[PDB]
Each structure stands twice: as structure tokens, then as C-alpha cells.
Amino acid sequence: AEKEEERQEFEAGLAANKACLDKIQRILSENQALSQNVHPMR
Amino acid sequence: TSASQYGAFSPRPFFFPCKFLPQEQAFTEHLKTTGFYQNNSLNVGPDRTRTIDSPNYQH
Amino acid sequence: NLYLLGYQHYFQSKGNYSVHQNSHERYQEAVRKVLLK
Amino acid sequence: QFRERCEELRTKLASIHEKKVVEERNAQIEFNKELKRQKLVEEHLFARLWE
Amino acid sequence: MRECISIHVGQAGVQIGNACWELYCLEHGIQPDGQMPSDDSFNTFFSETGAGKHVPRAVFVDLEPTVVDEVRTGTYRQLFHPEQLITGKEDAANNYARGHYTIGKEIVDLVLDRIRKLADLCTGLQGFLIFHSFGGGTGSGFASLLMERLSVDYGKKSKLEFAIYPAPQVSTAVVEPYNSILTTHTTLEHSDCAFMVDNEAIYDICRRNLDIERPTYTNLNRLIGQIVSSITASLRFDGALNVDLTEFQTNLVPYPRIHFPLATYAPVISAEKAYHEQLSVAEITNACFEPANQMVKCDPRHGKYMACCMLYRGDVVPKDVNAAIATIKTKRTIQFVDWCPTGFKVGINYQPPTVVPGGDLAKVQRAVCMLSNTTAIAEAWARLDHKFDLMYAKRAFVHWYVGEGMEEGEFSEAREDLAALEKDYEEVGVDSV
Amino acid sequence: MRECISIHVGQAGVQIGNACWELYCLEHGIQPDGQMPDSFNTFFSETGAGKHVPRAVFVDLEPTVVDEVRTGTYRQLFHPEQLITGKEDAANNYARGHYTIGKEIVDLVLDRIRKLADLCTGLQGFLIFHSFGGGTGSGFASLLMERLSVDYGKKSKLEFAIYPAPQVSTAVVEPYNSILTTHTTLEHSDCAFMVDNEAIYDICRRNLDIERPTYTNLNRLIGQIVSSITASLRFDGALNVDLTEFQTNLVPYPRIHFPLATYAPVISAEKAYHEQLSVAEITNACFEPANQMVKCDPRHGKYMACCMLYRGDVVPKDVNAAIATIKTKRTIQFVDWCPTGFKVGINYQPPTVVPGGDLAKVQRAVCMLSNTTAIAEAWARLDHKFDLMYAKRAFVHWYVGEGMEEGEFSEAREDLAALEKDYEEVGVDSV
Amino acid sequence: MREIVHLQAGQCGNQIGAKFWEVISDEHGIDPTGTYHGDSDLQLERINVYYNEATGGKYVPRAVLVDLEPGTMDSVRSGPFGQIFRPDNFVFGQSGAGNNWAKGHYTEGAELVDSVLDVVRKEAESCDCLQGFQLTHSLGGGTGSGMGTLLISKIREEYPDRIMNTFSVVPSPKVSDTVVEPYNATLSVHQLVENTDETYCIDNEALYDICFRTLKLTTPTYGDLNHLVSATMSGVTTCLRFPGQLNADLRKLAVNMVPFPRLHFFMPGFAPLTSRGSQQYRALTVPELTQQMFDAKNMMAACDPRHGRYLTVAAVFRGRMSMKEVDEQMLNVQNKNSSYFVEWIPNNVKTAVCDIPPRGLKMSATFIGNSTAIQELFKRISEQFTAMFRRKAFLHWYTGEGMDEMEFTEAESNMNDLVSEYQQYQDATAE
Ligand SMILES: Nc1nc2c(ncn2[C@@H]2O[C@H](COP(=O)(O)OP(=O)(O)OP(=O)(O)O)[C@@H](O)[C@H]2O)c(=O)[nH]1
Numbered sequence A: 001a002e003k004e005e006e007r008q009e010f011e012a013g014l015a016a017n018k019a020c021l022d023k024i025q026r027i028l029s030e031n032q033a034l035s036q037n038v039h040p041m042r
Numbered sequence B: 001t002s003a004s005q006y007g008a009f010s011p012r013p014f015f016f017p018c019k020f021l022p023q024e025q026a027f028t029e030h031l032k033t034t035g036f037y038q039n040n041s042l043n044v045g046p047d048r049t050r051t052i053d054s055p056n057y058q059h
Numbered sequence C: 001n002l003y004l005l006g007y008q009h010y011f012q013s014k015g016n017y018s019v020h021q022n023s024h025e026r027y028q029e030a031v032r033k034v035l036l037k
Numbered sequence D: 001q002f003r004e005r006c007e008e009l010r011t012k013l014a015s016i017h018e019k020k021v022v023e024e025r026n027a028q029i030e031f032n033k034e035l036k037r038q039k040l041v042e043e044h045l046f047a048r049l050w051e
Numbered sequence E: 001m002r003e004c005i006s007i008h009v010g011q012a013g014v015q016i017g018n019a020c021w022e023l024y025c026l027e028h029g030i031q032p033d034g035q036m037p038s039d040d041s042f043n044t045f046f047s048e049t050g051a052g053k054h055v056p057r058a059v060f061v062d063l064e065p066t067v068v069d070e071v072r073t074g075t076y077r078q079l080f081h082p083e084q085l086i087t088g089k090e091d092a093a094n095n096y097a098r099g100h101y102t103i104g105k106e107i108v109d110l111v112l113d114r115i116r117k118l119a120d121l122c123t124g125l126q127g128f129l130i131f132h133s134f135g136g137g138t139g140s141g142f143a144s145l146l147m148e149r150l151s152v153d154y155g156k157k158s159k160l161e162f163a164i165y166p167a168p169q170v171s172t173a174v175v176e177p178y179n180s181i182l183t184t185h186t187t188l189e190h191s192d193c194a195f196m197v198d199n200e201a202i203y204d205i206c207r208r209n210l211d212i213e214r215p216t217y218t219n220l221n222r223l224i225g226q227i228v229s230s231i232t233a234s235l236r237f238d239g240a241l242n243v244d245l246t247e248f249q250t251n252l253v254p255y256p257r258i259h260f261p262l263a264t265y266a267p268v269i270s271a272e273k274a275y276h277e278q279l280s281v282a283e284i285t286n287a288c289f290e291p292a293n294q295m296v297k298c299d300p301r302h303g304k305y306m307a308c309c310m311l312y313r314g315d316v317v318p319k320d321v322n323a324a325i326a327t328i329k330t331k332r333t334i335q336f337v338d339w340c341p342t343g344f345k346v347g348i349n350y351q352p353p354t355v356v357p358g359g360d361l362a363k364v365q366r367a368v369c370m371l372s373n374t375t376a377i378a379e380a381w382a383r384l385d386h387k388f389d390l391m392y393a394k395r396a397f398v399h400w401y402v403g404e405g406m407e408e409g410e411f412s413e414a415r416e417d418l419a420a421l422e423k424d425y426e427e428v429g430v431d432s433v
Numbered sequence F: 001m002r003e004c005i006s007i008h009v010g011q012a013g014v015q016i017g018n019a020c021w022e023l024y025c026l027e028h029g030i031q032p033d034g035q036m037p038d039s040f041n042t043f044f045s046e047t048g049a050g051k052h053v054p055r056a057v058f059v060d061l062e063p064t065v066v067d068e069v070r071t072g073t074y075r076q077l078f079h080p081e082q083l084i085t086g087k088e089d090a091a092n093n094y095a096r097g098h099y100t101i102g103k104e105i106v107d108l109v110l111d112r113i114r115k116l117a118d119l120c121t122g123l124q125g126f127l128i129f130h131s132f133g134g135g136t137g138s139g140f141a142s143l144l145m146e147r148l149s150v151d152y153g154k155k156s157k158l159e160f161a162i163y164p165a166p167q168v169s170t171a172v173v174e175p176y177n178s179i180l181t182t183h184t185t186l187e188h189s190d191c192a193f194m195v196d197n198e199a200i201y202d203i204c205r206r207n208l209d210i211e212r213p214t215y216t217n218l219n220r221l222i223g224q225i226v227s228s229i230t231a232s233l234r235f236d237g238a239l240n241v242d243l244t245e246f247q248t249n250l251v252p253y254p255r256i257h258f259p260l261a262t263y264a265p266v267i268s269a270e271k272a273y274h275e276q277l278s279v280a281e282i283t284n285a286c287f288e289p290a291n292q293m294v295k296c297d298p299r300h301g302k303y304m305a306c307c308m309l310y311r312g313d314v315v316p317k318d319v320n321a322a323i324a325t326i327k328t329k330r331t332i333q334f335v336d337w338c339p340t341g342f343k344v345g346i347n348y349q350p351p352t353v354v355p356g357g358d359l360a361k362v363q364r365a366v367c368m369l370s371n372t373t374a375i376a377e378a379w380a381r382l383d384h385k386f387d388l389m390y391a392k393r394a395f396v397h398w399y400v401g402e403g404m405e406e407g408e409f410s411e412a413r414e415d416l417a418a419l420e421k422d423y424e425e426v427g428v429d430s431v
Numbered sequence G: 001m002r003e004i005v006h007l008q009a010g011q012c013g014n015q016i017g018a019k020f021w022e023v024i025s026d027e028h029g030i031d032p033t034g035t036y037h038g039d040s041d042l043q044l045e046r047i048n049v050y051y052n053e054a055t056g057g058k059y060v061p062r063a064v065l066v067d068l069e070p071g072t073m074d075s076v077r078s079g080p081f082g083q084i085f086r087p088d089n090f091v092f093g094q095s096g097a098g099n100n101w102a103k104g105h106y107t108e109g110a111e112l113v114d115s116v117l118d119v120v121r122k123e124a125e126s127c128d129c130l131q132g133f134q135l136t137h138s139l140g141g142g143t144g145s146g147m148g149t150l151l152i153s154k155i156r157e158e159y160p161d162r163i164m165n166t167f168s169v170v171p172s173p174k175v176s177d178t179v180v181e182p183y184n185a186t187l188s189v190h191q192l193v194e195n196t197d198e199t200y201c202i203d204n205e206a207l208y209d210i211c212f213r214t215l216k217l218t219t220p221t222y223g224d225l226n227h228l229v230s231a232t233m234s235g236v237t238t239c240l241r242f243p244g245q246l247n248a249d250l251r252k253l254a255v256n257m258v259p260f261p262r263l264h265f266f267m268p269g270f271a272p273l274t275s276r277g278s279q280q281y282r283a284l285t286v287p288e289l290t291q292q293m294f295d296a297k298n299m300m301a302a303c304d305p306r307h308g309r310y311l312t313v314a315a316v317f318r319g320r321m322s323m324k325e326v327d328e329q330m331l332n333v334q335n336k337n338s339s340y341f342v343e344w345i346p347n348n349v350k351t352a353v354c355d356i357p358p359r360g361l362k363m364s365a366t367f368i369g370n371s372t373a374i375q376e377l378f379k380r381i382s383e384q385f386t387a388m389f390r391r392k393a394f395l396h397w398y399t400g401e402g403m404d405e406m407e408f409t410e411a412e413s414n415m416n417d418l419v420s421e422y423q424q425y426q427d428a429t430a431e
């Protein structure tokens, strides 16, 4: 049972890494340099 | 006149920087305009023996 | 990027909150008082 | 928080930033070209007056 | 908030102020009228009214009316408050004596009252930026006396000094060395920092790197405005290492008699040249050490650096900054005084410098300003001493100043003062090894 | 990471640079604008705008030769600062380019060298190209090396130099410049690749069937020589060989850095139709005296060091077989103290071809760097011609009027006399 | 109960603690607005150590942020956890120090020392049993190096028994941003020796070294650097907030780390830092933590401890480990290295265990060690401070503040006496 639990923890770590890579892809697709303020004549 | 050339520029957006992130004083300005934290109160504080406060010691 | 290792919240990965309303003083009084379901 | 906590986004932002800077510089190039054309026509008309 | 006030004096002063203020308006967003089409990053230069208007903290002063009437007529005729622009009916005509004793004293009071009002408008002020020239009679004498009175008016406040120093070969005047000798006591005992710049070096830099032939005063003024913008950018906009004026004031001056740093800007290149050049921290900081890019006709290699203040701007990284500084310190010809192994004061800013239409600088994502206090500047004063001595030997033009009404011994006094200051620079250059 | 900077000098250097840099752009795929539509990073350099800039310094004392480049097809490829010009030239005078006109632009170049060097992280060496005949190619290049060697104590300085042809000549005072430049290529050089234009003339007319060539044909075959040397650094191979490897295994004594180059196969496409090309056939032509790139016969001398450069669909098994056959031939001699004298470098990418060129598209190639003492006879001819003129003191007033001492002429002649004497001792095979 | 008041000094201090407080709120499941959404009853069991109770289920900072410049604090109260602090604890003046230690210590500090003393007294009396305070600041500025010294000296008189930590940022000679640095540093360590229970020497250049090599981060900001010192000082009080098999606190280490009152400077280090190419090829275990930690490349101070002797060593482990493997390693490092440990102190090692693993991780360790290599910093600083002071350079700035000249002389002297007696403890016979 102990080794089964450790194996499932390892799988959970893999899943978390996959999810963070996918959201890295999404924020790669996003594009902005606004910094909450464009120059006042733009 | 050459001096008139200094201000002969119509505004067009590509003479302007890519981003614009200035210093915003919205909070510390108020905290300046008002007085800072300070207490002129009367002496208030419980008596404490630290390690144990108020046991039930008895014979 | 020090910790983009998977976050893996420990206690979240693996009642009394209803008793003490997520208040520290209430929990201290409770654990002095038993009252933990 | 997660915007702060990634480096590869800073790399991509820098890349796209410089890429757009290039086109803005091209606009500046066209501006300089029109200025040179202006000064040339000034010289031509003054030559006409001299003649 | 941190505010600074500009006291442009003389024809050079008002032209430089015009270029600088066009730069500021274009940067912060202000229309030529003075309104915003759309935080309070302008507070250092502009004051904000209830109607939404932006008002300058700049007192243009001149003794010849025309040089300010074209300003009063031009595109920014309504941006600038007319009582800020103060004029005199007659001028000194390259006479330090006239600008110091006869003509200035009429409008001393008016200029002092206006700057008092501007400092009243300011709540916590940071510095008085002075812009003038060493050759002009007004910009020498009137400037000198306004320092003399402003020192006792505000003993503690920082008084930054930007000045046109007479070029070693080319000159726009013949009587200029007397004025340049007599002014130096003011920038010695009544100034906090000075930035003497010769037009000849800027001409060489422009025709060399910018590749623009047939320059004019506008091309120089745009670079000077870029320098002042780089100085004030850490104050106006945020940075991971922000440096106010007091920080770099402290980390440049070893002794009270030594407040004459030297300026340097990079990259200063045309757009066509910038097309084929990668511009990195190392490249720009190596270009800022070349003697051909100095804004004063002196070679720092003939002397030794005592201090260096550093202002990066744009998309800059502290890792690259440290690597560049390490390379510079490993350099051998780049020498340092024995009493300073650590001699850099680094500050960084986020926003890249803007670009003026019709100007010359192409926009570069990162840029460098250097304020190096070295001991190679004394040779310029040596050239001035030689020319002034061969002048004063035969007592030429002295009748003008005497008939104006100042005593002749002040010539010898100023000559001895500058000789002593040159000796002080030599004493600093001496190493205890 | 591997980086090389070209320091081409003279009208030859610019014309060589036109052919060589055109080859590099086609080799890597660089558009005439300069945009790829990191094997290129040894020659080009990235910019912010995604533009690749050559690491070259073109210097000339006359503006017109470089002005064709400034208006050529590759105008935007080259950076304006890199191309350095001058108003007046040395005019076939060593002395003008060494004392009066050389000092005029010696310093501004060194600024550009430094900036190119600082852009590079790891520098391997400097490829320097010039001529022994012209004043700018000989006079100005001498000062630069003297300042470069004391500035860069360790970085390599290779030399592809135009040597005067034994019979034909484009100049009269050319023996004077050729003799007195030999000081620089001795104590300020690491290797040399002297070429006489005559030896290319017969090679092209015999092999490539072009009966009436031009310098562009001469320039292109020079380009293949430089490309084959650098090909190991640019691309991956089974046995990569860098500059430091073959410098070490070619110079037995520091006063001997004068080998002979040889490129093979050099055949027209139509005669390549009838010829099956293998590793053995091409490596036999690399030892043919008729295919020698310098007007001398190695059969009158002895090899002491042979450096072998292979490239293309080559196999190490067939390389070893070719070497064994070479060693079993009494026409080829080797010095006593070098029982093993070969150095094999293997590259994968075959050499490219240029439209409008002369060579055919060939799958395999071979470059040869053979040091021999039969190059000794070449400068003896130059000694004979210089002495036959210097006795009557002809053209001397030109060099004196510039301000160079007359005793340097005798000292220059003596130095090559000791040079040839040393190459006799190496030719001596003692017990 | 056991409470900490987090004192904050300077732009270094504000940015360091803001990242630190970002970490701890995540350690205790606190949103940027202030409530508790977590499911860990043990996260709330000891949350009063750092936070104070507010109405509506809110928990507030027990921090006092101090600076002499208005620009830094809006950066704090606009960031990831800006709004969690309260505007009253924000204390700061109108005029900076300009990196001048004297201005923040004498001239401008005196107007602001009152108000910060007011607020910290209220955070002190708010808690029932305050364990002790805590400051993060830099020795390279004008306020943290300046005002920060003036703050500590007063509250030492006010609260003598309470422990006092300091994560002082010491300047680096290899990378320095301030010409007037040595004057501030020499005038601050004299304050640190007299009035401080506990100090950790953090050097920025070491953080730049650890990120480039072990982390292989391409472009590090100061935020990555701030995260390092936050995780370190999370690992010091981790046993205080959570239960463990063998518990400890700051005072448990404090008595166990100070053989003599003059020595309270230590070299923090972190165990589990690996790059992203190292995550796949690893197997976390108690030995691998000790291997990564004991490597002197891993330390965040600016000196190599092989040049000195380990006086006392602490290792605060965090997670679930078997203790036989814990103590056997600590004995194992003592036996193998028979030259780097002091002999008059057998069993040099203090070890503590906290069951709750670090945030985002399964195993970790934190280290506090006293070596003789700390004297390598001071004597190198004295090499620069004397070079400044022999010519009285940059002295009129400090002299005009109203101080005399003997204060410099006593500063180096006390600094010289510290390293002199520190050298003696390196060369001392136990028997
Ligand atoms: N760099 C630069 N220098 C200027 C400019 N305008 C004037 N000067 C300098 O000013 C010096 C002469 O003084 P001016 O500014 O013309 O006039 P002034 O300072 O008011 O003194 P007076 O002529 O007596 O009225 C010359 O040596 C110029 O170098 C300018 O626009 N740019």
C-alpha cells in the first residue's frame, strides 16, 4: 500500500507538470505589452 | 525661421515608446497628506508572568 | 523560475472548521475545551 | 503572481518587442526620406530665382 | 513629491530649454496647448490645474528680447506662462562686467520673486537646474549673480549646472576667455555639480556616428535634452535601482572643490547604421568609454578616473550590468585612483527613451549615460589659462570692463584661483604608491 | 564558440572577399538582403532585427575598389563601417604604405577590429589576405600585423598571400615590395599560403577548359580553398580539425610556416561525366606537380609535414587505403625524422556550387596542405632578380624619399638568404 | 504565545520581505485579500506567530515597513500581496539618504525613529509572549545600513531579553554598485557586534553565482534572488510554526550557535536546488540533501569555508525523514573531514526536524554554520575602507553631518579587534 501511494503521488506530479506546460502554451499565445498603461497619446 | 522648426511636428503615434509604465502615487500620497500612526494613549497592558498566566495553585 | 515543479499542496492532496468558524481564538478555546468532532 | 513567476514569457515579450521596434524604425526611415525630398526642392526653386 | 525647477539663462539657455521641453511634452503626453488627450509622473516638471492644464516650472531669462519673443510666438506660445519668460530691453554683449554689475541688478528682484513663487508652488523641491554658457555676457554675469543670491536664498538645495564651455579651437567670440575666467569662481564656490560641454566635441560626434553632415544648433540641443532626460528618468519613472539626484551627487564628488564630472551618451547612431548592429549592454558600455565619444575635448587616458556614475535605461538586466562592469575593471588602460577600487554608482530605469520627430537619434531599446569624474579635464583649464595669460599680458579689451566699473585686480584673482584649482587636480592625480 | 574574422587587405583582398563572402552566403543560405528565409555563427553575427552581419574588415587605400562593393548586389549585406577606404594609395610603394600613408589609417582599422572581436565570445584566429606586389597589400599589411601581434599574443593569424609569379608580372618594382614584406610574414605570422597567379592560369586552362579566364575565375577557386579549411568548424564531421590542430601538426620549427595548398578534384562538368571519382583518384592528383598551386616541383624537395582535408561522402576505410598506396611510391620522398606524416580530417557536408562558376557539383572533395622544402627554389629566383636590380640602385630614390633607411634593403636581402639556408638544413637528412 | 514582529528596512528590506510574506501566506493558505480558504487545521494552529487577528476572518501582517524614500512603498502596496499589509504600519519619510549612512543614522533618521518606535511598541504589547523581533536590511544603502542600525540599538535597551535576528545584506567586492559603500559597511558592523543576537550574511554575488550554475536561469531578476532568502528564513522558523519529531526554535539554535558573544555571523544555505535538466535524473533522499548542502558552491555567503574551520554547524531539516539516516550523516561528515572542524568542540552539529514539508516540495534542509571563513569578508572590506580613509576621500559628506573623525577610527579598530580574536580561535590547541 505504501509503494502504491508513492507511485500515485508521482503520477500526480506528472499531471501537474503537464498542466503547467499547457498554461505556459496559452500565455505564450497571449500577446500584450500594455503594463496597465498605453502612452497617453496612443 | 529655424527656431520655428523646433515645434513643427504633428503628433503621430510612432514617435512614442512601446510601453508606458509611470510612477503612480495613489496611496502613499494620501498617507503623507494625513498624519502617521502614533499613540498618545494612557498606559494599557495586562500584567503577565509569561510562562504561565493565572494558575490555580493551592494546598 | 525556482519552483515550477508541480505545486502539490500537501494537506490539500491528503467539521472542526464548522465548530470554530475558521477563527484562531475559537480553535484555541475549542482544543482547550475538547469539542472537536 | 503567475505572470511574475515565468521567465520564458519575458523572453517572448522581448522578442516581439524588438520585432515591432523594427517596423517603427521603418516608419522613421520614410520620414527621413520625405525630409530629404523637401530640402532638395528648396534648392531647386532657389536656383530658379537665381536664373 | 520630488520636483525640480529650470532656470534657463541666456540664448543657449532658452534654446536648450526649448529642446528639453519639447522632449518632455512629447514624453509625458502633453499637447502643445497643454492638455492631456487621455500616474502623476509629470509632477517633477509640470503642475496640474483644476481645468486639467499642465503648467511649467521653468523660468526663461534673457537680456535680449528677441530670443524670447520667438518663443512667445512659436507653437508653444500658450504652453508657457508669459511671466516665466522674463526679458530685458538691453543686453551685456559678451561683457561679464555689464551682466554682473550694471544690467542684471535691474531685474534681479523680478527673477528672484518669480523663482520664489515657483518654489512656493513646489512642496518638497529637489533641485534647481541651471543652463547657461561661459562665453555670453548675460549667461556669464547674470547667471553668476543669480547663483550668488540664490545660494543665500536656499543654502541647502541642490543647484545642478549645465554650461557651454568655450571650445579649444573654434570660438564664436573673441572676448570670451575673460568671461570664462571670471565666471569660474561662481561654479567653484556656489555650485553643487557642473557639466561643462564644448560644442566641438558634439560636432565631431554628430558628423562621425550620426553621419549627419551640415549640423546646426538643433542637433546639439536634442542630444543635450537626451542627457537631461536620462538624468531625470530615474526620478520620473520607476526602476529596480532608482537613483535620485542626491545619490549620484554623493557618489561622484571626493572633495568639495571637485564637482566637474564629464558626460557621455550611447548609443548615438543613425537608423540605417542601427539596422545592421546588435545593441547590447556590453557594446553600449564599451562605446561609452571611447575617448572619441566624449563630450569634452580631453582624453581621460591622460588622467585617471576617480568616480563613475552609471544610468542605464530601457530593457536592461543586472547580470549584464555586472558582467560589463567586471570587464571594464579588468581593462588596463582604464585606470583608477589608488584610493578607489570601488568607483561605480549604478541606476537602472524601465522606460526606453522616446524619439522626437525630425530629429536624429533612432530609438534603441536600451541606452547608457555615464557621468565620469576624471582628472583629465584640467588640461582644458590649462589651455584657457594660456590663452587668457597671453590676452591679459597686453591689457586688451580691459578698458571696456573698467569703464563699466569693476576693479582690475579681480582678473588676477580669478587667474590665481583657477591655477590653484588646477594644482588641486594635480594633487588628486598624485598616487601614494 | 568557433569564430573567424577576415582581415582582407588590398585590391586582391576586396576581390577575394567578394568571391569568398558570396560563397559563405550561398553555403549557409544567406539572402542578398541578409535574412535567413548555428552553422552560420562562425562567420555571421546576429542582430536585433534578425539580420546576419559578416565579421569582415575590408581595407583599401583607394576608394574606387570598395565603391563597387558599396553599390554592388550585396550593399545591404555589409555594414557601412566595416568597409574602410582612403583618398590616396601607396601606388606600388612599400614605403608609402609603411611610413606615410600606412600610419594614416592604421589606427581607425584597429577600432573596427576590436568591435568585431568584442562581439565574438571565443576567437579562434584571424584570416588575413593581401598581396606582395601592390603597395597597399604589402606596406599597410605589414604595420597591421606588427600592432596585431603585440595586441593579440595568442590568437591565430593565418596568411593567404599573393606571391609574385616567376615569369609574368603586372608591375616592375614588385621585387622590392616582395622582399621587404618578408619580415612581417616571419616574426608576425603563424602560417602562409603563397599563391602565384600563373599557377592558377595553367590549372584552369588544362583542367577546366576555360581557355580565356579572368580573376573572378581565379578568385572562386581561392574561395574553395578557404571554405574547405573552415568547413570542419562550420559543420559536423567524423574527424573535425580546427585551426590549432593543423597549425601544430604542420610546423616542425617556428621559422618554417610556408606549406603549399592543393585543391582536388578541379574538373569541368562535361569531363566529370566520363570520370568516376573516388577517394583514391582525387588524392593522387593532390600530389601531381602539374596540379601544384605554386610554381615548384616537390619531386625536387622532400615533404616533412602533410595535412589532409577530406570532405563529402568519404569513408575512413578508403582514406587509410589511399594513404598506404601513397607511402608505397619512391617518387614521393619524406624526411628522415618524420616516419608518420599525415593528418586526416573528415567532414560530412559536400562543397556547394555557384551558378555561373567553373567547378561541377561533386559529392566528394579533398584539400591538401603539404609542407615541402621544394618551395626553397621559389625565393631563390626572387633573390636573383632583386640582386640583379639593387646593384644599380634603380627606383631607390622613391623609397628613400618616403623616409625608409637604405640599410633595410640589405638587411631584408640577408634575412631571406638565411631563410633559404635553413630550408637546406631541413632538406639535409642526417643520421 | 510565540510571536514575531517583522521589521523591514530599505528597498532591499521591503522587496525581501514582500516575497517572504508572499511565501508564508501561501504556507498558511492566505489569499491576497487576507482570509483563510485552506483545509489544513495545522495551518491555523500556529498562525498567530506571524499574523494578528482581524474581524471578518481576516489576518493581518505583524510587519513594520520602513524606508526613507516614497517611491519604494507603492511598489509594495501594488504587488502580488500589496493589500494584505495595513497603511498605518507603513512608515516612511520625505527625504532619502543618498546612500549616506550618516544621514539616515544622525540627521534624517532622528525625525522618524520616534514613529517606528511607536508602532513596534504596539505590535509588541499586542502579543502576549513575544518571542523576539526580526529585521531584513542591507549594509549597502542609507536607511537599512543607517536607520536600521539606529532602530536596533534603541529596542535593545527597550527589550533586552528578546531575541533579535538580522538578515543583513553584505556588499560584494566583485560586484558593487556604490562608491561610498565601504564607509557605511564599516560603520554598521560595529553596531551589529554590540547589539544583535543573530545575524546571517547574505551576499548578492553568491546568489548570482548559484542561479547561473546550479539553476541555469537565463535572465535572473531580483525576484528570484528574493525567493532564495525567503525560503531560507522560512526554514529557520519552520519548526516554530509546525510540530516535528525533534522540535526547535530560534533560541534553541541561538544558545547552540554562540560559543562567545562576539561571534553571531553565519552562512545560510539551502539544500534542494536543482535545474530543470536535473529533475528527471534524481532520487530524493537524506544523503542527496547533505551532498548538495555541504558543497561550498551551494552557500549563499561570499567566502569558501575550506580556508577556515567549522565552529558550529546547524541543520534544520523539513519533511518526513528517518532519523537514523539523519544522524548517521551528521556523524559521517565529522569523521571523514578531519581538518575543517574545530577540535575543542566535539559533536559540532545541531540538528532539528520539522514534520511538515516545505511548500511545493517533498524534502528539504536548511543550514546555519559558523566557520572561520567569515573573517575573509571583513579583512577584504578593511582592504577597501582603509584605502578610502587614508586620503580622507568622500569624507566631507559624512563630516558635514555633524560627526567627528574618531568614530571612523574606532569602527575599524573594533572591526580589526573582531577578526584578530577570530583568527585566534582558528589556531587554538584543544588539549
Ligand atoms: N550649444 C549651444 N550653444 C549656444 C546656443 N546658443 C548660444 N550658444 C552659446 O552662447 C555663447 C554666447 O552667448 P549667447 O547665448 O549667444 O548670449 P548670452 O549668453 O545671453 O550673452 P550675451 O551675448 O552677452 O547676451 C556662444 O559661445 C555659444 O556657444 C545653442 O543653441 N547651443
Ligand SMILES: Nc1nc2c(ncn2[C@@H]2O[C@H](COP(=O)(O)OP(=O)(O)OP(=O)(O)O)[C@@H](O)[C@H]2O)c(=O)[nH]1
Binding pocket: F009, F010, F011, F012, F013, F015, F016, F060, F061, F062, F089, F090, F091, F092, F093, F131, F133, F134, F135, F136, F137, F138, F162, F170, F171, F197, F215, F218, F219
Ligand atoms: N589573384 C589575384 N591577384 C590580385 C587580385 N587583385 C589584385 N591582385 C594582385 O595585386 C597586385 C597589385 O596590387 P593590388 O591588389 O592591385 O593593389 P594594392 O594591393 O591595394 O596595392 P596598391 O596598388 O599600391 O594600392 C597585382 O600584381 C595583382 O596580381 C585578385 O583579385 N586576384
Ligand SMILES: Nc1nc2c(ncn2[C@@H]2O[C@H](COP(=O)(O)OP(=O)(O)O)[C@@H](O)[C@H]2O)c(=O)[nH]1
Binding pocket: G009, G010, G011, G012, G015, G016, G067, G068, G097, G099, G138, G140, G141, G142, G143, G144, G145, G146, G169, G177, G204, G207, G222, G223, G225, G226
Ligand atoms: N538581492 C537583492 N538585493 C537588492 C534588492 N533590492 C535592492 N538590493 C540591494 O540593495 C542595495 C541598495 O540598497 P538601498 O535601497 O540604497 O538601501 P536603503 O538605503 O536602506 O533603502 C543595492 O546594492 C542592491 O544590491 C533585491 O531585491 N534583491
Ligand SMILES: [Mg+2]
Binding pocket: E011, E064, E091, E094, E136, E137, E138
Ligand atoms: Mg547673447
Ligand SMILES: [Mg+2]
Binding pocket: F010, F011, F089, F134, F135, F136, F137
Ligand atoms: Mg592597389
